[PDB]
Amino acid sequence: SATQGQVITCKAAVAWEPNKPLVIEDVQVAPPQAGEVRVKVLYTALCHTDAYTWSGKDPEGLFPCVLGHEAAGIVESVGEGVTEVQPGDHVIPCYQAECRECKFCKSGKTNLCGKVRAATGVGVMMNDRKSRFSINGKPIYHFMGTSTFSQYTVVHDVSVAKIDPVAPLEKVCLLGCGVPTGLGAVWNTAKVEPGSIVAVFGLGTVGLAVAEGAKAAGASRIIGIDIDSKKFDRAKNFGVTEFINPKEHEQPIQQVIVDLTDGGVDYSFECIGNVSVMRSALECCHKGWGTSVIVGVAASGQEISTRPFQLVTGRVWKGTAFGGFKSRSQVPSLVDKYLKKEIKVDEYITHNMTLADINKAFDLMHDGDCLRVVLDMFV
Amino acid sequence: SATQGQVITCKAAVAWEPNKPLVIEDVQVAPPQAGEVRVKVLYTALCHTDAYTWSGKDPEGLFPCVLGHEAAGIVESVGEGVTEVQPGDHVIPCYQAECRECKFCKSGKTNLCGKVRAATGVGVMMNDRKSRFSINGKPIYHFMGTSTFSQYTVVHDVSVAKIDPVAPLEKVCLLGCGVPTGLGAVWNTAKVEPGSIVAVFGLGTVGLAVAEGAKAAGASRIIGIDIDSKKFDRAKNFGVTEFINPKEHEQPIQQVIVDLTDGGVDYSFECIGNVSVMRSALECCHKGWGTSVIVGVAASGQEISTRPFQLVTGRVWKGTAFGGFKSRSQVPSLVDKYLKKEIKVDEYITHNMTLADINKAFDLMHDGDCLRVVLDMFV
Ligand SMILES: NC(=O)c1ccc[n+]([C@@H]2O[C@H](COP(=O)([O-])OP(=O)(O)OC[C@H]3O[C@@H](n4cnc5c(N)ncnc54)[C@H](O)[C@@H]3O)[C@@H](O)[C@H]2O)c1
Ligand SMILES: NC(=O)c1ccc[n+]([C@@H]2O[C@H](COP(=O)([O-])OP(=O)(O)OC[C@H]3O[C@@H](n4cnc5c(N)ncnc54)[C@H](O)[C@@H]3O)[C@@H](O)[C@H]2O)c1
Ligand SMILES: [Zn+2]
Ligand SMILES: [Zn+2]
Ligand SMILES: [Zn+2]
Ligand SMILES: [Zn+2]
């Protein structure tokens, strides 16, 4: 190819400082080293995770950085010893790695591979503990091991899911975050049985995928809870059967739910990242067997609380990370399901913009009057 | 019989008011009404649950009352419509009912039958919403639906486990509380797999039964944690393989455990009823799959807390109520395990005294070195 083994110069949205507009820059992208993959990022979506770090409220935040973690693209080059992917392969770079060999991958009880976490957590690559991005010979931090706000990114091979090349890249970029998180919270983490009564707190992309997962599981009732009643109508198509706006009830939300379900739900899913709501989601579960799954990522430092009698009396408290899906092994299977029209993906995208419109997409996300916004990186 | 249909006059340890010595009184015990069983209580054990109410720390505490909830005896008479038990049957009255036909009993996902809780919780019988005990025509409240500190008690038939008549009643009185709670926390709630690594917080009767359950489950390591190192030696016989005294380490106990178990335990069991230790028990669990079971009953109003990242990263928080055992269906099965020498019971009894020694027995329990104290009711 033209770029193989060479430093690439491309466009990237750089966050020089927290809480300031992103700046589209020309960046240098170093070639991939051993166990690395350089990806042409065709489309990137954005989510609250990108905004949390950009805001300056993330203690793990490192500036200047290239944000972004939901993307689909094409392998431009591979580093030494890469064999699962080759140039030209269609891929989804994932924030959750799957080395297949560690304690976690070989456990059979989790998807939390820790192989590259010490490097990705500090915005660098494992091979040399340095970033592959630079502006004027000065490094720019990676983010979540993905950095999808760059036209070309360098990621660890263990994070690269190889997907069907016929799959639309402007759609499947969602399968690296929200959609599998929501579906897997139901299918892998909770393991929702047919006939279950489900409560979904937060009717955004994540809560809507939980609703779709619970509908595929054959839940008898899917109760949708949101503080914005305008989000109720779009929710019906994702499987939500009933709605509650907590602002319309003086009594605690858990009490409303308990009153409507003869003691509480079989499964609840908190899809917001609000510690108060996480307690309510636990407490709205039925005595004896009710299970609350935390999906929402709460701001660092915040605590969840309840009275232990809640768990002594049969309620279970758990959480999910990427819906318990193993990235390399299972993300391709989700793309296959989507192609066979077995799962929805397109319905979670409300807007399509271009890389130059990054700030406008973040403002729209900040308004909260959209679902996923997909950006075309090469307009 | 001599007493069938008649009011019995017998000895009972009465708690007239909180935090005062119990008085051995002559009480009138009314005959059983519909769905009731009058039991000759041959032996009663004492536990922290009797002391919590006695001390006046229980806001649900009603005085004057007949305390006691761990006993074994013989059916003296039955009320109309009672068919599972007959006069002369050997029985264990249980604080947890099993009606076999409610939402909970049928569900197949819990042992928390709610049939008689409304009446037992207020120290009365369901049939007429009054007590069967009186002194000078004045009522004395029941306790836990059991009131085992009386030579004769009246209990709901749904709380009566029928047991093998050869089982020694001075030993099996323990199978109505502590021992099944510990064993079941492992076998039923956690469902501990062979080779697991277990942490047990609190090495009293309950923690020791957890250790025995975990050892029977094939746990590879059983780490016992107690603030009193004198409790370590006796714990080895119960299956505890290693010990930690939190007072001997400046680092939080969960860190000490993580450091000894390559990331944390597979299962932890809190057997104290201390909210701060409950948090440590959750946090000492391994990322991805570690499960913590709350066994200890905390003081009313106390809250448990953690950071939600602990659950999002794969730890599970649950609790147990009577070890998930169904009283009428499974307590006889535990009596059978004891008679097969499959489970220990004798080993948790450090003292045998008489009903007249009740206050001496509570004093011993307050000192907190003893395990179970068994009282001979008819001496
Ligand atoms: N665990 C994981 O692996 C993982 C992965 C991806 C995303 N997430 C988390 O999922 C959450 C949701 O993401 P999203 O993209 O769907 O967000 P979103 O902004 O589209 O949706 C959140 C919804 O919650 C609603 N809401 C806010 N406060 C509320 C309250 N008090 N009660 C009820 N509803 C309320 C909002 O109106 C909105 O509809 C975030 O917290 C994100 O961190 C977790
Ligand atoms: N969930 C149920 O169904 C159920 C049923 C019966 C009993 N229980 C609970 O079991 C608990 C234990 O009962 P028990 O009879 O074994 O009590 P116990 O007094 O015999 O044992 C408690 C132990 O905890 C230890 N301890 C106290 N503080 C400690 C700390 N900070 N760290 C470590 N160890 C500490 C004490 O030294 C003691 O050895 C009680 O809280 C009781 O409510 C629960
Ligand atoms: Zn995302
Ligand atoms: Zn791995
Ligand atoms: Zn007890
Ligand atoms: Zn029942």
> Measured between CB atoms, does A102 come within 8 Å of chain B?
no
Strand partners, B197: B221
Query: Closest by alpha carbon to B42, among B21, B11, B65, B15?
Result: B11
Residue B333 burial (C-beta neighbours within 10 Å; 0-12, 13-18, 19+): middle
CB atoms within 10 A of CB B107: 15
According to DSSP, residue A141 is labeled: B
Q: Inspect the interface and report whether the beta carbons of A307 and B313 lie closer than 8 Å.
A: no
CATH class given for the domain over A1-181+321-379: alpha beta
Q: Report how far ligand 3's centroid is from the alpha carbon of A70 (Å).
A: 6
Could you please state the CATH topology (level 3) that the domain comprising B182-320 is classified under: Rossmann fold (3.40.50)
Active site residue: A38, A48, A315, A328, which one? Answer: A48
Ligand 1 mean position, distance from CA A328 (Å): 25
Structure tokens at B213: 């359950």
SS3 for A136? coil
Q: B272 labelled as ligand-binding?
A: yes
Say if A366 is an interface residue toward chain B (CB within 8 Å).
no
Which ligand has the minimum distance to the alpha carbon of residue A144? 3
- Element at B294 (helix H, strand E): strand B291-294
Q: Is B49 labelled as part of a ligand binding site? A: yes
Q: Which of helix, strand or coil describes residue A234?
A: helix
Cα A222 from Cα B207, distance rounded (Å): 40
Give the 3-state DSSP-derived string for B52-108, with helices as H, strands as E and coil as C. HHHHCCCCCCCCCECCCCEEEEEEEEECCCCCCCCCCCEEEECCCCCCCCCHHHHHC
Of A275, A288, A296, the CB nearest to B104: A288
* DSSP string of B190-217, one letter each residue: I-PPTT-EEEEE--SHHHHHHHHHHHHT
Q: How far is CA A105 from CA A185, A215, B17, B180, in A?
A: 18, 29, 59, 36
CA–CA gap between residue B96 and residue A21 (Å, rounded)? 61
- How many whole angstroms from A31 Cα to the centroid of ligand 4? 24
3-state secondary structure A64-112: CEECCCEEEEEEEEECCCCCCCCCCCEEEECCCCCCCCCCCCCCCCCCC
Q: How far is B152 from chain A (nearest CA, A)?
A: 30
CB contacts of B310 in chain A (<8 Å) are: 319
Strands A133-135 and A267-270: unpaired
Q: Is the CB of A47 under 6 A from ligand 1?
A: yes
CA distances in angstroms from A368 to A47, A230, A362, A371, B296, listed in the order given? 11, 11, 10, 8, 44
Cβ-defined contact of B311 to A317 (cutoff 8 Å): yes
Testing the interface with A: which of B309, B310, B325 to mutate, by most A Cβ within 10 A? Answer: B309
Domain boundaries, chain B: 1-181+321-379, 182-320
Distance separating alpha carbons of residues A58 and A51, to the nearest angstrom: 10
**Residue B298 touches chain A, beta carbons under 8 Å:** yes
Are B158 and B35 a contacting pair, CB within 8 Å?
yes
Are the C-beta atoms of residues A67 and A143 closer than 8 Å to each other? yes
